[PDB]
Design a protein around this nucleic acid. Structure first.
Length: 88
DNA sequence: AAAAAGGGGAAGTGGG
DNA sequence: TCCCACTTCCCCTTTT
């Protein structure tokens, strides 16, 4: 099944959900979530995953924080902004 | 102050 | 069975 980081990257590079997420610094791989619209993106993640419960941004960031352990995505010190590793 | 964002141990779930 | 990649819970610390 698809990985969360790909889900997010595929969205950035396609362009749907520009109300929910966008590139802060594309070349560098920095992307940011919208405060008011992040939930709609998080819910789509769950619908797609086929989770039995409803996906929230809180639970999605919980998973996101795990990539900081393996390096795929890291949190940047700006509100709702993360950064993909040399893979973006 | 108050609310949003950030955090993380640990048990639980689904697919392979 | 076990492993992985989250997912759910629940509650606490920091930034805005």
């Amino acid at each position: 099944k698809i990985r969360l980081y790909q889900f997010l990257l595929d969205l950035l590079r396609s362009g749907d959900m520009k109300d929910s997420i966008w590139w802060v610094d594309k070349d560098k791989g920095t992307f940011q979530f919208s405060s008011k619209h992040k939930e709609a993106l998080a819910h789509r993640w769950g619908i797609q995953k086929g989770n039995r419960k409803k996906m929230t941004y809180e639970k999605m960031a919980r998973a996101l924080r795990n990539y900081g352990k393996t390096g795929e995505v890291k949190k940047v010190k700006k509100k709702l902004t993360y950064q993909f590793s040399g893979e973006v």
